[PDB]
Structure 1
Amino acid sequence: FPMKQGVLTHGRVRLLLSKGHSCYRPRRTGERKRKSVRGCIVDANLSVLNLVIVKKGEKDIPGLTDTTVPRRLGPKRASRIRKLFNLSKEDDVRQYVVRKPLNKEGKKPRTKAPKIQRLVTPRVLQHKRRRIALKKQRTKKNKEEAAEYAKLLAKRMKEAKEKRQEQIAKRRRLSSL
């Protein structure tokens, strides 16, 4: 049973765990499970103890610090590549992305590079211009439609007011009659 940080015990206790809680992988969304975890206090009753060395000593231990395993993956986001190689706002980034060479038995050597994400590309620029064109055309069509309705309403209202005026004239005729 794994140890859980933030329990302040030394034995075994069952906890309700949800998404975001350690020592639990939910199957469906919202699923919570009763899992028995171990206390965060280290005692003699442990099968395996996890240790992380953060300060290097004077001696070169041949188990951990003797050899440095290179990181398997390189940066993919354009901003992270800029942070890594101290790029500026104007210099291009496509020429500085690290590509991992490929080599094994049989096949030819290969170099593969990840797709750079969130960069300035013509397709993004065209999409931004298209949606700003949609934004301006909506106002243009709304203005034209409003003008057409104003003309139509004016036509209808003047028809109604002259019809009411001749009705009032008939009332005047009745009054004078």
Structure 2
Amino acid sequence: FPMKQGVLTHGRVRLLLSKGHSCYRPRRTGERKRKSVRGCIVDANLSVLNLVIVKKGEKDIPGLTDTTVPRRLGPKRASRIRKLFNLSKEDDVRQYVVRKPLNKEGKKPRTKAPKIQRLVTPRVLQHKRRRIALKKQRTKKNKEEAAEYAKLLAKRMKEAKEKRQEQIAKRRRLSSL
């Protein structure tokens, strides 16, 4: 059973674990589960124990510190490639994306590159221009339809006031009667 950070025994204990807890992968959404984890205090009753060296000593151990493992993937976000290769705001990123070499038996050697996500490209600029054109034509058609309704209401209200005008004229005729 795995040890778990922040449980503060030396033995084993059972917990409800959720999404975002350690030592548990939920299958369906919102699922919780009883799992039995181990205390975070170390004692002699451990099968395997994980150690992470943070400070380099004097000696070059042939197990760990001699062989550098190269990091497998290169940065994909344009912002992180700007941070990695210290780009300015103006200069391009596309020549400074790391591409990876590819070689095995039989087939041709290749070089492969990631899709650079979130860069300023003309399709993004076209989308941004398109919805702001949608906004200005929404205000346009609102102005149009409101003015058209104002004209139609002015028509109907002058009709109603002239009809009630001849009705008030009939009232004055009956009062003169």
Q: What TM-score does the superposition give when structure 2 sets the normalisation length?
A: 1.00
Cα offset, 1:72, TM superposition: 0.5
Q: What is the CA-CA distance between 1:133 and the residue it aligns to?
A: 0.2
Q: Deviations over 1:54-91 (max 9, x none)?
A: 00000000000011000000000000000000000000
SS of 1:66's equivalent in the other structure is coil
In 1, Cα distance between the equivalents of 2:85 and 2:116? 15
In 1: Cα distance, 2:79 partner to 2:133 partner? 29
Q: Could you say what the CA RMSD is over the residues aligned between the two structures, in angstroms?
A: 0.3
- 1:33 deviates by 0.2
Please give the per-residue CA displacement for 1:9-45, whole angstroms capped at 9, x wherever unaligned: 0001000000000000000010000000000000000
SS of structure 2 residue aligned to 1:149? helix
Give the superposition deviation at 1:144.
Answer: 0.4
- In the comparison of the two structures, how many residue pairs are matched? 177
Report the Cα distance in structure 1 between the residues aligned to 2:93 and 2:85, rounded to whole angstroms: 9
Q: Post-superposition shift, 1:46?
A: 0.2
4+ aligned runs moved over 3 Å, structure 1: none
- How far, CA to CA, are the matches of 2:62 and 2:75 in structure 1? 30
Distance 2:63 2:32 in 1: 40
Q: Tell me by how many angstroms 1:136 deviates.
A: 0.2
Deviations 1:133-172 (A, max 9, x none): 0000000000000000000000000000000000000000
Aligned-residue offset at 1:117: 0.5
Deviation at 1:102, TM superposition (A): 0.1
Matched, 1:81 2:62: no
Question: How far apart, CA to CA, are the structure 1 residues paired with 2:151 and 2:56?
Answer: 83
State the alpha-carbon separation in 2 of the partners of residues 66 and 127 from structure 1.
51
Structure 2 CA distance, aligned partners of 1:124 and 1:74? 24
Question: CA offset at residue 130 of structure 1?
Answer: 0.4
Instruction: State the TM-score, normalizing by the size of structure 1.
Output: 1.00
2:99 aligned partner? 99
**Which residue of structure 2 lines up, in the alignment, with residue 169 of structure 1?**
169
CA distance in 2 between partners of 1:81 and 1:152 (Å)? 60
Q: Distance in 1 between matches of 2:175 and 2:47?
A: 112
**Aligned mates of 2:67, 2:11 — CA distance in 1:** 37
Identity of aligned pairs, percent?
Answer: 100
Q: Which residue of 2 aligns with 1:144?
A: 144
Q: Structure 2: state its 5+ residue gaps.
A: none
Taking the aligned partners of 2:56 and 2:45, their CA distance within structure 1 comes to 28
